[PDB]
Subunit: 117 residues, 3 copies
């Protein structure tokens, strides 16, 4: 899985341990091995939410499976909780786009995850 956070929160406000916490909590939430979890945090962005430049975040979570109605609501509670606690971003100024990726459409290690045919 891959999780990307774009935010107008300054780099200096991103706490020590943030990437690691995301990595571990996402491994637990998705049930995927932490060795396969990638995280990407992009601070100091020029963005607006509702026209306001108060702290906000635009996020993506990509996973092969483990994406769905109830699961995505669970991820949102987890991830919004972390963004609020660590970056002080209000949950109602966060968007997270969820993508259920087909194994054939994810490249890794010179190939993809479609090794069957």
């Amino acid at each position: 899985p891959m999780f990307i956070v774009n935010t107008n929160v300054p780099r200096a406000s991103v706490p020590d341990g943030f990437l690691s916490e995301l990595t571990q909590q996402l491994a637990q939430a998705t049930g995927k091995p932490p060795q396969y979890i990638a995280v990407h945090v992009v601070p100091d962005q020029l963005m607006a939410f509702g026209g306001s430049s108060e702290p906000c975040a635009l996020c993506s979570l990509h996973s092969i499976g483990k994406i769905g109605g109830a699961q995505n609501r669970s991820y949102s509670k987890l991830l919004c909780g972390l963004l609020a606690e660590r970056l002080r971003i209000s949950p109602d100024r966060v968007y997270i786009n969820y993508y259920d990726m087909n194994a054939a459409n994810v490249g890794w290690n010179n190939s993809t995850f479609a090794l069957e045919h």
Copy 2:
């Protein structure tokens, strides 16, 4: 809705009020209320279009509904027009990826927009 612009145009060339203008124009175009519109502009990028590093942009528009053949043509004219007028980027050096998002696949405010089941 969420609109992202990545461009090699300098930060200084992004006019103040550009995010506000995008927010207002997108609310009008999509029929969505401005409170739910997010905008993100990323200048000074290392990019090429057709092998050339003249001004260009790679963009995305994510929306729950309001994405489609004729609507996307209308969005393209609107958005290219703004990028041309405001950032001086030629419309034939702009790509915009459109995404019709399912409500269940967009997280916000500790949950998603699938509140029904």
Copy 3:
């Protein structure tokens, strides 16, 4: 087509000629003219892969068609090869998301490709 690379490799470690090589090799692999190919490289990123901040890359390739099982494996071999050679990123620390775009969902020059 368009290809984006986000990496924690420093900007100074991106070699002269990299964008051009990506453009031409992607033109070759996708069967589309190089004047159609867009490339975007984002160095100095704050990222981790498997909990480690050794060099890694998160990428995307969008194309109207030319996306599929065997084709994507070929793109991956090509792109991981370039990232390893040019940016010294290990292939098992690269992800590439492939998107088969509908022509109606790609805007360009005031319209779409539908």
